[PDB]
Amino acid sequence: DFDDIHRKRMEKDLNELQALIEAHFENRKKEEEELVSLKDRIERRRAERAEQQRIRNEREKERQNR
Amino acid sequence: TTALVCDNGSGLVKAGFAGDDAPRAVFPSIVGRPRHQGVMVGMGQKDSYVGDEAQSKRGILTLKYPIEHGIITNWDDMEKIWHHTFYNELRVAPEEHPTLLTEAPLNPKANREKMTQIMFETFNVPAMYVAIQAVLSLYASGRTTGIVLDSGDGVTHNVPIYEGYALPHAIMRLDLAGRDLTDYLMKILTERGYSFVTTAEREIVRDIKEKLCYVALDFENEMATAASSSSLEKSYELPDGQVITIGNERFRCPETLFQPSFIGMESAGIHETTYNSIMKCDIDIRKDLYANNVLSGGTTMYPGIADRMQKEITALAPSTMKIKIIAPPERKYSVWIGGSILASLSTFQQMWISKQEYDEAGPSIVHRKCF
Amino acid sequence: YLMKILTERGYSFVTTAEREIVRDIKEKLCYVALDFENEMATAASSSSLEKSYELPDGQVITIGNERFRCPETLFQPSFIGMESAGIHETTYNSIMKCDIDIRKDLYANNVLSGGTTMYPGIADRMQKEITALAPSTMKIKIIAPPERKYSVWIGGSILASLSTFQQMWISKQEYDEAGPSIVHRKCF
Amino acid sequence: SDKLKEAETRAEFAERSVTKLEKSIDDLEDELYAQKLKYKAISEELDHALNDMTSI
Amino acid sequence: SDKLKEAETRAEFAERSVTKLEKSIDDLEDELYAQKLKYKAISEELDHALNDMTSI
């Protein structure tokens, strides 16, 4: 007894810390930069949609104005 | 085959196969019948949602715990909980697995006998064994001595053990536990305007207690500080909005543990029943018990309790002895980890209550040599 | 109320037959304003709202700010002298009487039905009002299917077509044994 | 005449509604992107912290 | 008849546009709200970490 405390504690004392650091690094890398880039891409597409909407609205208002 | 280490508890049922690190399925032990009428046809509405399913439909249920203070008050509901645990959370038929239940100290005999009778007749297990909830928590710490304070959610008990020889005359069982703290918190929240009454809102108050409350190192200084500054007021968002702000209710709810006069209980706090439990022991093993005080159970997870308790005991104890409080990070599942370790032992493999033995002596076999 | 406020321009409808004409006017022209005071101010300055309508015999009429004042009575029942609160606040009160744990689901699944909820622009006014009343965190969503008028009957057809429901009918022999008071009994 | 008056009127309502919807859509999307970018800035704060934690 | 046909088709197209826009709005709303809850949770756990640091 009291000799399995080493073999159940020291293991996770380093392996768990290193593995969680690895998980945090990979999750941040996968998540944050890709999300910001994708949001910028969607913003550019949204601006293009806004331009298309403005053009169509203006041309239809020009024709229909009677 | 492998053994099933179930642990009924009172508030959270923890179960899993023997030999692992953590319980496989942990879910509240509540059985809630619906209370309204119900107009949709064919919706597939059941008559009783148990376990973690009734913590999601709790808006239209009346949850009721089947275990009040360690003892079991509603046997049909407890049978339903066990059936759910075996068949849906573990999906292993009990006909092929030994079981290791756990029971608080100083409980009524009839409860234990009915438990074994159910396990042998309804579920028809091969062999079951009942163990005291504190010896397991001592197993999990890897010690062999020490006095363990297992403050669960139903009942707080304090079993001292030396060199493997338990001291039956020094067990101090006190019935203040997490549930009474939930009720007291729900009662002092009314001083700001928030009223929780329904049995469903008791769960919300429990969540508030878990996430916000903490044990003060010194009570009077905290009461004075919270009454002048506002650095303590932490806010919390209800399940529908309308955030609430908890002031000095934060450290007044768990203070009831050290002053049970708050909820009208006469007895002394958990800081003084441990010292009394030690002083009943012999004069030559008091140093070891002082040095190996073990904490377990859910309710001992309050942030800052391992320092308050040490300060209190150091105040009570003689100045020469060293007071050390073992507070492992895996406190909540300490009893179940110990249960897994005990069930995995080879020396223990012949202590099970085999079914043929029960057939020969009846349910009263549990009080006999097979304890 | 529309028939009563039309008299402010000169058009008097009195006969019970002309109530049908006023109903047609209400159906075809009235709409619910998103913001009441701004619309009242706009209709009193410009003339972009005045829509005309041809009676069953000629003599077209022009409806001004009577357009959004008729259906505004729903959100301010004080117009027709009723004390109670509008349909924007009785829904919030009906929610708040429910238990504290099912309020989010009710907030997110508010359903509109019935004919009178077909006014153009009501699904936005009601959402704005409830969002004003409700806590800021909850999401308020208003389900307004295009088949609103017949929603009750479509649901009735679905319910009558169910197999599980086939044994809930009040069979005639049961009525013969317990009288007409059978409806309040188990067969609801 | 009744039919086409109805159709054009409800169509005009549809156009104004849909344009309001488009303004709503753009505002929601841009606000979502701003919030997500704030979150990713927080994530890179945490990632700098994790690089410090590389001390372990 | 010609004006009626053209008006009806324009109306139906705009209507289907309306429905699709509503669906898109709902989905983006669900995702944005999930992000919002994620942010609140991360901030709250961050503050809990700060208070844990205060403790120790």
Ligand SMILES: Nc1ncnc2c1ncn2[C@@H]1O[C@H](COP(=O)(O)OP(=O)(O)O)[C@@H](O)[C@H]1O
């Ligand atoms: N993190 C926590 N902080 C404070 N209290 C907690 C925490 N977790 C659980 N509790 C309290 O402990 C109780 C669970 O105790 P538990 O050890 O599961 O009891 P049992 O011995 O019946 O298993 C809960 O009712 C809750 O009130």
Ligand SMILES: [Mg+2]
């Ligand atoms: Mg326990």
